[PDB]
Structure 1
């Protein structure tokens, strides 16, 4: 029985070369024993019955043999020479009765084309030729980022007990622009074919929340590991780990309440970034909410962190408690600072933007686009300058200075005494 073998072949972009073998039982690949690869030394084996079709095309390391399986998986074998094509074609035809297809790829350098959802891979065609293909197994998540914009996140190739170390620069995110009234249907079809986790059970949803940064009526759906923001033009998925801080701050109008999320990495809308999400509630808005949790899961994971049912209390309180319970982040409320007018903050302008400055126990926080967070540990000195019924506050820190202008002069003494109490160096010109 003529076993045909190829040395120096790589499996799925493996860093280590291996020996590839064709047998009547199937395909085999084994890593070459010369590299200390912390990693199982077990041979990869693909049964002959699982092979659907095989394509030949140009890869990074020479020629690539791409094997399509009946289980909708794509196997990539790279490192072949151009001469190997005739031998491989004859052996694959003889052993598996499968034609080896030669697939030519577009080299034009154009970023426009047509996407084509094939059974196991997303194909991008440029002038009726494939430019690139992404296996559905490499897609971790997909999210509509605008009316014509689809963002696909790819599985980060890090450390998994079942995968060979990858060598090179890794693709993390692909954004497509699909014009016409069409991107929503493409997103639905991609979701069905990529087989993403289904029957998702949000623990709690909040409808029609009016944001300010960016301004929009978003639905907030909360899950065990992640928060989803659904909007008319943009869907966002935020991991609970990426929420750094939660602020719950009353607006000085005494009619509204602000809930502010600090997110790292900052949310993207096209080119603009939102490190802070600013939600605006009415103080008189009451909501009753039951958590969608089984009694066994509630007792084991969420007892003492979340209430099973929230009565008819203010929406911003319920939301702040749910965020605290799911993200394990402390909610920052207004500190011991009280303005001359007994208010928890002061009106000021940062450059051309009018807003409210909150002196919280650990930090100064400005709450109008752009949102500014300044921890007292990072502040070198605060300089009070005369512009006047108003005065200006320059906060100096290791990365620059921020001038807050148009502050009422009556608020000068309360602010100075509070900042001195927090151990901040105040200088009066």
Structure 2
């Protein structure tokens, strides 16, 4: 065979972005030249150790693992170049390029292996995929779960943003396997974020447990399936309300535009907390940076009730003041009235400048928006005062099923607020 070979249709993958270039093999070694980056990679003949050939995305692909524990990768080859590569390596490098396609059975389970700056998810003997750990911009852990957040290249149209691995428990290792996986990842990656992360918060609209990551200009509502991102520019008002039984707290966020989910749009983000649910949070910032950003409204480390913490954070973030119940106190001593609406029971709170009905299809009506009100009396003479509210826009909201004493108190309240009682 000849002492030199060349290839012009070779590619190179770099952080998910494909890059073309030329390749040349010779007794001196293997020299590749990228076109977009203009870099020149060289592998001496005395460094190669293992050569794998596998059908990659762009045609086929060669994988060269050298004595230095580093693995180079090339793409853009044809199925016939394998014979040439193997013959050249066997005649000059004493190596035989062997084929080793990836697992094509399509299974989301297998084993994980670490080697240099590259992670490999395999199944038995055939690999499933590989992940260069050097490209990880962050590594987080959870309950039997590890998550890797990567950087992002402009040329990569479909960039792999985030990956997650469910790590089962293994008491034989002594240390938590999740912590072990995280340490193995950090030992090879170069991690460089969210201000604070609340994990699992009882949400009513939407329903379910959702973690909340805070950012300087938005908040990431992460769920077990669906995720949302609400910029602070979309927030309108923050409402902190107590529960009728005086045991829970409602934290309502008025959104605009409303977050969309298929064929439904949510105009309010409702959260439910317990007064006996404390927390101790530590920001991902320094003291001086926090002083400059929040102007001292927050501190590097805080502790207190969970709802209080959320209220303080959201206030310091949005600058809008958190609305609180007014001077209303029902006959039952509660700060609301239990009433029905749109075939659903719920709580109506007379705020300082409007009404807010929660939580099932919530509603909010400011005093200025109300055209008039009507204390319709239902069938009975006891616990049958429908507090209908017609707005200046023409929408009439019917809040039916209200106790007699609640109606008497609301009557005095509305007479104090001075509203058009029809």
Query: What TM-score, normalized to structure 2?
Result: 0.61
Residue aligned with 1:253, SS: coil
Q: How has the CA–CA distance of structure 1 residues 297 and 174 changed in structure 2, closer, same or farther, with 3 Å as cutoff? A: closer
CA distance in 2, matches of 1:261, 1:106: 47
CA distance in 2, matches of 1:121, 1:382: 68
Q: Report if aligned partners of 1:137, 1:194 keep a CA contact under 8 Å in 2.
A: no
Q: 1:89 aligns with which of 86, 91, 104?
A: 86
Is structure 2 residue 245 aligned with structure 1 residue 253?
Answer: yes
CA distance in 1, matches of 2:372, 2:139: 46
CA distance in 2, matches of 1:15, 1:80: 14
Q: How does 1:184-195 map to 2 (within 5 A)?
A: 185-195=176-186
Q: Report if aligned partners of 1:390, 1:408 keep a CA contact under 8 Å in 2.
A: yes
CA distance in 2, matches of 1:10, 1:362: 65
Instruction: After superposition, give the CA deviation of every residue in 1:352-390 in whole Å (9 maximum; x if it has no partner).
Output: 76432446689975544x5747698xx999999998415
Instruction: After superposition, give the CA deviation of every residue in 1:266-309 in whole Å (9 maximum; x if it has no partner).
Output: 9x9xxxx9x946242428x8999997975544444443442578
Q: 2:132 maps to which residue? A: 135
Q: Report if aligned partners of 1:116, 1:124 keep a CA contact under 8 Å in 2.
A: yes
CA drift at 1:82 = 0.9
Q: How has the CA–CA distance of structure 1 residues 412 and 362 changed in structure 2, closer, same or farther, with 3 Å as cutoff? A: closer
Is structure 2 residue 7 aligned with structure 1 residue 6?
Answer: yes
Q: 2:295 maps to which residue? A: 303
Query: What TM-score, normalized to structure 1?
Result: 0.60
CA drift at 1:333 = 1.6
Q: How has the CA–CA distance of structure 1 residues 334 and 418 changed in structure 2, closer, same or farther, with 3 Å as cutoff? A: farther
Q: Report if aligned partners of 1:11, 1:29 keep a CA contact under 8 Å in 2.
A: no
Extract unaligned runs of 5+ from structure 2.
Answer: none
Q: 1:117 aligns with which of 113, 123, 130?
A: 113
Q: 2:33 maps to which residue? A: 29
Q: How has the CA–CA distance of structure 1 residues 179 and 14 changed in structure 2, closer, same or farther, with 3 Å as cutoff? A: closer
Residue aligned with 2:182, SS: helix
- The size of the alignment, in residue pairs, is 384
Q: 2:21 maps to which residue? A: 18
Q: 2:40 maps to which residue? A: 45
Q: Report if aligned partners of 2:152, 2:161 keep a CA contact under 8 Å in 1.
A: no
CA distance in 2, matches of 1:386, 1:226: 46
Instruction: After superposition, give the CA deviation of every residue in 1:235-260 in whole Å (9 maximum; x if it has no partner).
Output: x9998968965542233334543345
Q: 1:282 maps to which residue? A: 275
Q: How large is the Cα RMSD of the aligned pairs? A: 6.1
CA distance in 2, matches of 1:9, 1:318: 56
Q: Report if aligned partners of 2:21, 2:32 keep a CA contact under 8 Å in 1.
A: no
Instruction: After superposition, give the CA deviation of every residue in 1:123-163 in whole Å (9 maximum; x if it has no partner).
Output: 3434642233333345555666766xx3645536452xxxx
CA drift at 1:224 = 7.8
Q: 1:348 maps to which residue? A: 339
Deviation larger for 118-127 or 256-265: 256-265
CA distance in 2, matches of 1:54, 1:261: 57
Q: Report if aligned partners of 1:227, 1:237 keep a CA contact under 8 Å in 2.
A: no
Q: Report if aligned partners of 1:221, 1:229 keep a CA contact under 8 Å in 2.
A: yes
Q: Report if aligned partners of 2:273, 2:306 keep a CA contact under 8 Å in 1.
A: no
Q: Report if aligned partners of 1:117, 1:190 keep a CA contact under 8 Å in 2.
A: no
Is structure 2 residue 156 aligned with structure 1 residue 155?
Answer: no
Q: Report if aligned partners of 1:57, 1:65 keep a CA contact under 8 Å in 2.
A: yes
Q: How has the CA–CA distance of structure 1 residues 289 and 419 changed in structure 2, closer, same or farther, with 3 Å as cutoff? A: same
Q: How has the CA–CA distance of structure 1 residues 291 and 172 changed in structure 2, closer, same or farther, with 3 Å as cutoff? A: closer
Q: 1:322 maps to which residue? A: 313
Residue aligned with 2:240, SS: strand
Residue aligned with 1:106, SS: coil
Residue aligned with 1:118, SS: strand
Q: 1:58 aligns with which of 51, 55, 66?
A: 55
Extract unaligned runs of 5+ from structure 1.
Answer: 32-40, 160-164
CA distance in 2, matches of 1:198, 1:16: 23
Q: How has the CA–CA distance of structure 1 residues 98 and 391 changed in structure 2, closer, same or farther, with 3 Å as cutoff? A: farther
CA distance in 2, matches of 1:108, 1:288: 46
Q: How has the CA–CA distance of structure 1 residues 151 and 45 changed in structure 2, closer, same or farther, with 3 Å as cutoff? A: same
